[PDB]
Amino acid sequence: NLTTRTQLPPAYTNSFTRGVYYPDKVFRSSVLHSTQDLFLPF
Amino acid sequence: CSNLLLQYGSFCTQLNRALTGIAVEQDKNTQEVFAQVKQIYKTPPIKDF
Numbered sequence: 001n002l003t004t005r006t007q008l009p010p011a012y013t014n015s016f017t018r019g020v021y022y023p024d025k026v027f028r029s030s031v032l033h034s035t036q037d038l039f040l041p042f
Numbered sequence: 043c044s045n046l047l048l049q050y051g052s053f054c055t056q057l058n059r060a061l062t063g064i065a066v067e068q069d070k071n072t073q074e075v076f077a078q079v080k081q082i083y084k085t086p087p088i089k090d091f
């Protein structure tokens with residue numbers, strides 16, 4: 001157990017243009033592919 | 043159902059593009075018919091014709 005604690009209110013931050021992953025394992029170049037999936041909103 | 047439709051995709055882009063072209067074409071048609079002159083000549087007040 002650890003007790004040397006000092007709680008603070010939950011800090012927040014703006015996440016922008018983050019959380020994009022390759023949706024498949026196919027090589028694809030010069031394409032404006034569109035997908036629908038579990039993605040992190042901008 | 044939207045996810046199932048999404049694999050088509052280009053069909054509806056095509057359809058919406060066609061209908062947008064039609065709408066623009068109509069506003070065109072009205073312009074070319076009625077907007078022949080870009081000077082709003084107001085009618086004279088006295089009708090001595």
Ligand SMILES: *[C@@H]1O[C@H](CO)[C@@H](O)[C@H](O)[C@H]1NC(C)=O
Nearest residue numbers: 001002003004005006007008
């Ligand atoms: C302290 O440790 C015991 C067992 O390791 C655990 O059951 C208990 O929840 C702990 N209490 C705190 C305040 O960490």
